[PDB]
Amino acid sequence: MKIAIINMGNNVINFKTVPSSETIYLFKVISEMGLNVDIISLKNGVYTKSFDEVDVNDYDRLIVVNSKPNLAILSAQKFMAKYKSKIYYLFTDIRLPFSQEEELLIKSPIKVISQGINLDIAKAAHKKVDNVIEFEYFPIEQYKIHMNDFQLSKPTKKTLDVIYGGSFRSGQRESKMVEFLFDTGLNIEFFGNAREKQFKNPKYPWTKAPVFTGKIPMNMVSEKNSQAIAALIIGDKNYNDNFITLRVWETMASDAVMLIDEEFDTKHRIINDARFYVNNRAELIDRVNELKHSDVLRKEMLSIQHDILNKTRAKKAEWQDAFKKAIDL
Numbered sequence: 001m002k003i004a005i006i007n008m009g010n011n012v013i014n015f016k017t018v019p020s021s022e023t024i025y026l027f028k029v030i031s032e033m034g035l036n037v038d039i040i041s042l043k044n045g046v047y048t049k050s051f052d053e054v055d056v057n058d059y060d061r062l063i064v065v066n067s068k069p070n071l072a073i074l075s076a077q078k079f080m081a082k083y084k085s086k087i088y089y090l091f092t093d094i095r096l097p098f099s100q101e102e103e104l105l106i107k108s109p110i111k112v113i114s115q116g117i118n119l120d121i122a123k124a125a126h127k128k129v130d131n132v133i134e135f136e137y138f139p140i141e142q143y144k145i146h147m148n149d150f151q152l153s154k155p156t157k158k159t160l161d162v163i164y165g166g167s168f169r170s171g172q173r174e175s176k177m178v179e180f181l182f183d184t185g186l187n188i189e190f191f192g193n194a195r196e197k198q199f200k201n202p203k204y205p206w207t208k209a210p211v212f213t214g215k216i217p218m219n220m221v222s223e224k225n226s227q228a229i230a231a232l233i234i235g236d237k238n239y240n241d242n243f244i245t246l247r248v249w250e251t252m253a254s255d256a257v258m259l260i261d262e263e264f265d266t267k268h269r270i271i272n273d274a275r276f277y278v279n280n281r282a283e284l285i286d287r288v289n290e291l292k293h294s295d296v297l298r299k300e301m302l303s304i305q306h307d308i309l310n311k312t313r314a315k316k317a318e319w320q321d322a323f324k325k326a327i328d329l
Contacts (some may be wrong), residue, residue, distance in 0.1 A: 001060040001329060003030065003037045008066040009096075012048050018218055019067040026090075029143045030217065033320045040079065042071060046121040051075050051235070057081045061327050064098070065090045066202055077104040079179065086111055088138055088327050094238045097125040098133075113326050115140045115240035131254065138326045141246050145253070145309065146316050152306055153226040153255040160228035161186040161288050163209075163256060165221060167193035167245070169236060175204050176234050176261065180284050182206035191216055191224060214279045221247070223257035229298065230293050232284070235264035244270065252309045256293055257301045275301060 005027055010019035014097045023039065024047055031037050038059075041048040062083055064076075073146055080087060081104055090115045098110055109132035114122040117136045126159045132305060144150060164181055170176070178199065188210035191253055196209050202302065216224050225231040231251045247269060260270060262279045270276075275297075278284045291298045 001036070002058060003035055003061045003063060003327070004054070005039045005063045006031070006036060006079065007072065007074050008064050008098075009073055010067055011072045012039055012114075013045050014047070015041060021066070021218060024132075025147065026143055029146055030063075030323075032148065033323065035324075039182055042075060051079050056080075057084055059083075060085070061088060062086075062094070063088045063090065063327065065092070066096045066098075067093065075107065080106050080108070083108055086328070088113060091115060091122055091125075092140055094121070094125060097122075098129060100129075111136065111328075113138045113140065115244075116239070118242040121238050121242055136326055138322060139244060141244060141249065142312065142319060144246055145249050145313050146319060150253070150313070151200075152253050152309065153222045154224040155194050157227055158227065159187075161292065162188045162230050162232060162259075162284070163228035164188070164190050164232045165192045165216070165224065165233065166190070166234070168195070168198045170201075172237050173231065173234070174199070174201060176236075178204040178206050179281050180232060180234060180261065181210045183208050184210075184281060184285055186285065186288055189213055189228070195327045196290060212262040222254040225251055228256045229238065230257040230259045230288055232260060233260040233264060233270075235261040240264045241266055249309070251261065252305050255302065257298060258305050259287060263323075269307060273301075273304060276305070280309040286308070 003036055007019065007023045010017065010025045012020045015021040015024065026040050027037060038052055039048045040051055042050060044050045044053055056079055064087055085108060087108050088112045089112045091097065091109055091112045098112065100106055111134045112122055112126060113139050114135055115124060117137050119137060124136050181190055185208050190210045191213045194212060196212050199209065231254060233248055241272060260277050262277045268277065278287055279310060
């Protein structure tokens with residue numbers, strides 16, 4: 001069968017853009033499943049084919065990913081509007097559900113392959129889509145760990161207590177970042193798209209902020225994380241008890257102990273060990289001190305999380321088969 005992948009919102013040509021890179025990594029892992037795949041974009045290149053150089057109905061399955069209208073957007077729509085079969089939408093971000101004069105109207109039925117295990121959240125987010133639509137769960141984010149050259153970080157010299165990478169997402173996220181990363185009295189670093197000046201809501205007061213550092217190359221999350229004793233996984237609305245994110249795997253792979261905000265995984269799906277979960281600032285402080293004072297606890301926890309990462313990678317074949325079934329192969 002011939003499969004084509006389209007990035008609905010961004011242009012794809014190289015690794016010099018976060019959205020172009022993730023698309024190329026997905027393409028790589030799907031190709032490696034032993035599938036004839038192409039990426040359709042604006043231009044022809046070492047990784048893509050241009051919309052005008054391919055025939056839309058030349059492909060048997062069409063996979064769509066996504067991450068102010070522009071060229072990539074209008075072109076993708078036009079292309080999909082001429083496609084005559086079912087479109088497979090990878091639902092990887094709660095804020096980015098599929099969404100849509102005649103040359104742009106998509107009429108094909110749409111199957112949403114949800115990264116989150118709770119399909120009701122997936123159904124509610126697309127309640128505005130009139131197209132015939134069906135839902136299925138698949139852990140898409142494991143694509144990074146099934147990369148053939150994925151590796152676990154090795155013992156690193158610690159220069160930080162806690163590290164957190166992320167962008168300034170307001171609301172619960174803002175409230176949770178202030179709760180776990182501010183006024184702790186620990187040596188904390190916050191890397192990514194977030195600046196101290198953004199934390200100006202009188203609703204969430206704090207005295208002392210963590211060290212904010214820039215973004216880091218999207219292939220060094222684990223190495224950045226390894227400089228710390230622990231790395232934190234913070235909850236977000238609708239992600240909690242639903243999605244597992246790339247940050248979880250990147251953090252699990254690192255030399256830093258992965259501590260998870262309880263509210264993000266109340267059933268303890270990620271790791272069935274209470275030691276890895278914290279409910280508030282007090283617990284994070286106590287847990288980090290325990291880790292700092294017991295090299296034995298720290299090493300034990302690390303080997304447990306690396307173990308969980310490894311069993312998961314051990315099921316690569318079944319993950320591949322599940323993916324194919326999800327795209328009706």
